[PDB]
Amino acid sequence: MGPCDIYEAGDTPCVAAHSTTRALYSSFSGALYQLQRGSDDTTTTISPLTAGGIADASAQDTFCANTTCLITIIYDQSGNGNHLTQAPPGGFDGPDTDGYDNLASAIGAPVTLNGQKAYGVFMSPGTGYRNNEATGTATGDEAEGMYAVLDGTHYNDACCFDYGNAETSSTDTGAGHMEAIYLGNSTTWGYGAGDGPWIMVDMANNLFSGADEGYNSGDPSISYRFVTAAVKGGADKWAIRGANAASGSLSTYYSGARPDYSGYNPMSKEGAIILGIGGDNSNGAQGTFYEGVMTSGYPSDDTENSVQENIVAAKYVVGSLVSGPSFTSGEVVSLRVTTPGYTTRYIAHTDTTVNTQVVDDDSSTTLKEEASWTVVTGLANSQCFSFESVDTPGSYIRHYNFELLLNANDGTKQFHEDATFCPQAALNGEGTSLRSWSYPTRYFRHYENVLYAASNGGVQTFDSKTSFNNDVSFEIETAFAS
Numbered sequence: 001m002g003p004c005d006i007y008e009a010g011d012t013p014c015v016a017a018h019s020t021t022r023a024l025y026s027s028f029s030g031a032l033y034q035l036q037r038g039s040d041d042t043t044t045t046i047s048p049l050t051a052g053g054i055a056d057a058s059a060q061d062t063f064c065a066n067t068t069c070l071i072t073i074i075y076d077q078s079g080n081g082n083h084l085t086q087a088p089p090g091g092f093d094g095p096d097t098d099g100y101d102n103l104a105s106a107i108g109a110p111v112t113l114n115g116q117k118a119y120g121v122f123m124s125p126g127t128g129y130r131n132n133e134a135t136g137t138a139t140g141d142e143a144e145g146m147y148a149v150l151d152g153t154h155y156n157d158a159c160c161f162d163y164g165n166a167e168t169s170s171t172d173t174g175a176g177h178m179e180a181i182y183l184g185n186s187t188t189w190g191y192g193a194g195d196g197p198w199i200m201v202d203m204a205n206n207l208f209s210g211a212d213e214g215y216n217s218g219d220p221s222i223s224y225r226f227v228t229a230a231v232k233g234g235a236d237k238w239a240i241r242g243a244n245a246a247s248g249s250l251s252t253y254y255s256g257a258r259p260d261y262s263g264y265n266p267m268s269k270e271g272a273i274i275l276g277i278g279g280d281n282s283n284g285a286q287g288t289f290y291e292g293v294m295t296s297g298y299p300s301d302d303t304e305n306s307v308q309e310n311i312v313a314a315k316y317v318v319g320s321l322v323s324g325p326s327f328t329s330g331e332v333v334s335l336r337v338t339t340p341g342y343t344t345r346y347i348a349h350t351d352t353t354v355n356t357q358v359v360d361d362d363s364s365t366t367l368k369e370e371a372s373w374t375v376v377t378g379l380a381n382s383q384c385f386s387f388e389s390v391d392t393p394g395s396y397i398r399h400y401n402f403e404l405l406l407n408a409n410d411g412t413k414q415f416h417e418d419a420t421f422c423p424q425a426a427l428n429g430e431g432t433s434l435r436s437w438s439y440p441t442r443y444f445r446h447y448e449n450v451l452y453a454a455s456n457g458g459v460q461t462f463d464s465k466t467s468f469n470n471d472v473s474f475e476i477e478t479a480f481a482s
């Protein structure tokens with residue numbers, strides 16, 4: 001049996017079921033999600049390898065070879081047609097065309113479920129999916145349940161990384177017009193114990209960690225690499241349950257009456273489904289979604305425990321984020337441009353500006369150093385890397401407003417994430433392509449001899465598809481600084 005089979009057995013059936021990693025029904029073999037490669041913009045779908053099995057990743061790899069990929073649709077396996085597609089603008093605008101949110105990369109969250117490779121939805125700030133005309137989802141004060149397997153080490157404090165019931169207009173229509181899972185360390189509304197992140201329930205104009213608005217000590221910080229967040233709401237009652245999605249039981253962080261504030265009882269749910277964003281399209285949060293569902297009816301604890309066990313059985317394990325040449329901590333290198341007509345340039349810098357310059361044996365020692373980089377263990381992820389300036393030790397290459405700048409490590413998480421890159425086999429076949437860890441849809445890319453964290457097409461001029469593959473491919477060579 002799969003998650004939804006278990007929920008059906010408990011009389012609180014899935015009315016929405018999403019996952020880019022596995023089928024949530026033992027008998028599902030349809031499409032899990034849709035892809036679109038930047039090369040020609042064509043699409044293809046990825047289905048389980050077998051009925052009720054794991055996603056066919058090799059098919060994605062084949063289709064996305066020598067190019068980039070975005071996850072255009074996350075199909076609803078329940079049959080209700082509640083697929084998730086690019087989230088539209090609302091109270092707030094998205095950073096994409098006409099205010100839509102960004103689609104997520106297809107390779108930002110690699111994992112294996114019991115030895116079988118799969119891909120999750122790595123969402124960076126500005127990313128988001130939605131369905132404002134869903135069927136079967138709870139409305140008004142009707143009971144519902146939900147859960148999602150997320151990455152407890154990928155999150156921030158901006159509003160709002162949710163998954164659940166939201167407004168059909170994409171605007172904040174008031175308290176009680178929402179009921180969704182939230183995971184992050186925002187403290188603007190509710191928050192629990194510790195540094196975070198905390199699993200809270202977004203009920204509109206409030207992320208609740210318990211009965212009271214704001215602080216509630218009963219909600220602990222949960223930072224497992226794989227987290228199961230189980231939330232449910234009914235007639236003047238709701239609950240929060242969390243667990244290590246890779247081992248053990250669900251613990252109950254809250255169970256009881258609605259917050260005693262106007263608008264929260266009875267609730268006024270609207271039935272829309274959001275992912276990675278807030279109800280009014282607040283899109284500054286980040287996170288990773290692997291699988292999740294929404295149900296009709298208040299799931300019993302026994303039902304959720306069975307689900308949790310099934311998830312544990314799925315055996316989630318982190319996959320490799322790196323491919324191609326790759327580096328070793330402490331190694332000193334120089335990165336050469338492979339784009340025809342600039343093949344003698346190297347990634348260097350002029351103050352905080354990271355650019356490409358012609359560097360050779362006649363170059364001064366200062367320029368040789370500006371073009372030499374000490375590779376160190378990724379500041380935000382131990383699998384990837386960070387590039388430290390040879391001439392200016394203590395400073396690293398980081399993306400700011402999508403430009404690559406050479407700034408000093410200020411020890412903050414933000415800096416750490418803006419300075420972590422993952423080696424990927426060069427797209428043009430020559431060398432490596434440094435993929436941004438926090439923004440997997442972006443790579444090191446030179447545009448008019450300046451370095452940006454560019455995507456294959458986008459709202460910034462430096463995201464041009466023209467010569468993209470070449471501009472994101474570099475040959476790893478012996479450092480000039482010897």
Ligand SMILES: *[C@@H]1O[C@H](CO)[C@@H](O[C@@H]2O[C@H](CO)[C@@H](O)[C@H](O)[C@H]2NC(C)=O)[C@H](O)[C@H]1NC(C)=O
Nearest residue numbers: 156157185186187188195196410411412413414
């Ligand atoms: C969420 O957690 C992060 C990481 O613990 C907090 O970030 C720090 O941010 C402050 C305010 O910008 C800086 O003084 C610190 O140097 C940062 N520390 C680290 C370790 O990054 C962030 O403030 C927390 N957010 C909330 C709302 O509590």
Ligand SMILES: OC[C@@H]1O[C@@H](O[C@H]2[C@H](O[C@@H]3CO[C@@H](O)[C@H](O)[C@H]3O)OC[C@@H](O)[C@@H]2O)[C@H](O)[C@H]1O
Nearest residue numbers: 095124125126127399400401402403414418453
């Ligand atoms: O390199 C991208 C981010 O720029 C810096 O943040 C600045 C922020 O940027 C927004 C970040 O979120 C994206 O979704 C938006 O598309 C982008 O505009 O704009 C306001 C500035 O005051 C922030 O410093 C971050 O350092 C970096 O991660």
Ligand SMILES: OC[C@@H]1O[C@@H](O[C@H]2[C@H](O[C@@H]3CO[C@@H](O)[C@H](O)[C@H]3O)OC[C@@H](O)[C@@H]2O)[C@H](O)[C@H]1O
Nearest residue numbers: 339342356446447448449450464466467468471
């Ligand atoms: O990053 C180097 C190349 O820039 C982009 O090229 C475009 C070219 O840009 C020139 C880049 O070099 C500066 O010194 C020049 O002042 C500037 O004109 O302009 C014409 C466009 O058609 C080129 O694509 C390429 O993307 C990149 O390889």
